[PDB]
Write a protein that binds this ligand. Structure first.
Ligand SMILES: [Ca+2]
Lengths: 165, 167
């Protein structure tokens, strides 16, 4: 119970179902959090009171057809990231193994980014990471939500010291 | 740049630093999110406008002295959790290896919990559930936040089909 109920969903249909359950129970302030801009745009059109943007950390994505190679490189990334005190968030989306690193300064996210490149070609997979270009993309997608008529938008980050830059 | 800025921190000092940076940049609505109740209580005393409770999924914690045994138990938990489509969040805090599992229904959180118990025996470490599946404890900690003077509280979950009992 609380003043604001936040639905965290990576599936757009499951997001709608939980918003309907909370709205039918009388919840006045339902928020929807997702790293998927389409889920946030769908929550705006279907009943979301607040839209929460996930703009924290750095996401490393290993891609490959051999699952015993994506995990092999992900485990070494986890072991080294935990040794720096980072928080690691993993999900497997098709052939994409997404790894989000939070809780470490920008100097350590680059160390892990350079190790991810070394782990990619060492196991024959591909690596991609997020950068400053995603910040510009974030402000643009936020303005697309404002122009679609979003009244309350929240932006979440683990490090507002670098994000202000 | 949005109406609400949310500080997600697991370190109390880093939380205070980022709230101070945003307040001096003119942010009118600063929120603080943490799975640590003390960080939420410290953000309330700092002047946080919104406290976000993490009430989603299930948190299992491996404890032990051999780090390459907390890891290997965590690695096997990741392998099976990914086979269910789950999102896995890990952090290493002292001798505690915290594993949070979201995006899966109640029957899968139970099965992974029983596998964590089976993996703790195979590697000689201890596993406990340090979060999730205890709505009364969550509600009581929320009521401690109101009585300390929290005027805006947010509760976050990936599974309101089960958490609707809190309402
Ligand atoms: Ca959140």
């Amino acid at each position: 119970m609380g003043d604001i109920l936040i639905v965290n969903a990576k599936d757009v249909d499951e997001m709608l179902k939980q918003v309907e359950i909370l709205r039918r129970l009388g919840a006045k302030q339902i928020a929807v959090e997702s790293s998927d801009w389409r889920i946030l745009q769908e929550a705006l059109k279907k009943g979301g009171d607040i839209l929460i943007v996930n703009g924290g950390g750095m996401t490393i994505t290993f891609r490959g057809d051999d699952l015993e190679a994506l995990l092999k490189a992900a485990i070494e990334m986890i072991k080294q990231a935990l040794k720096f005190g980072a928080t690691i968030t993993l999900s497997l989306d098709g052939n994409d193994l997404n790894i989000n690193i939070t809780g470490v300064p920008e100097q350590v996210r680059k160390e892990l980014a350079k190790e991810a490149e070394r782990l990619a070609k060492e196991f024959g997979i591909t690596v991609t990471r997020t950068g400053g270009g995603d910040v510009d993309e974030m402000l643009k997608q936020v303005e697309i939500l404002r122009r679609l008529g979003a009244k309350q938008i929240a932006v979440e980050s683990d490090d507002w010291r670098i994000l202000q830059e």
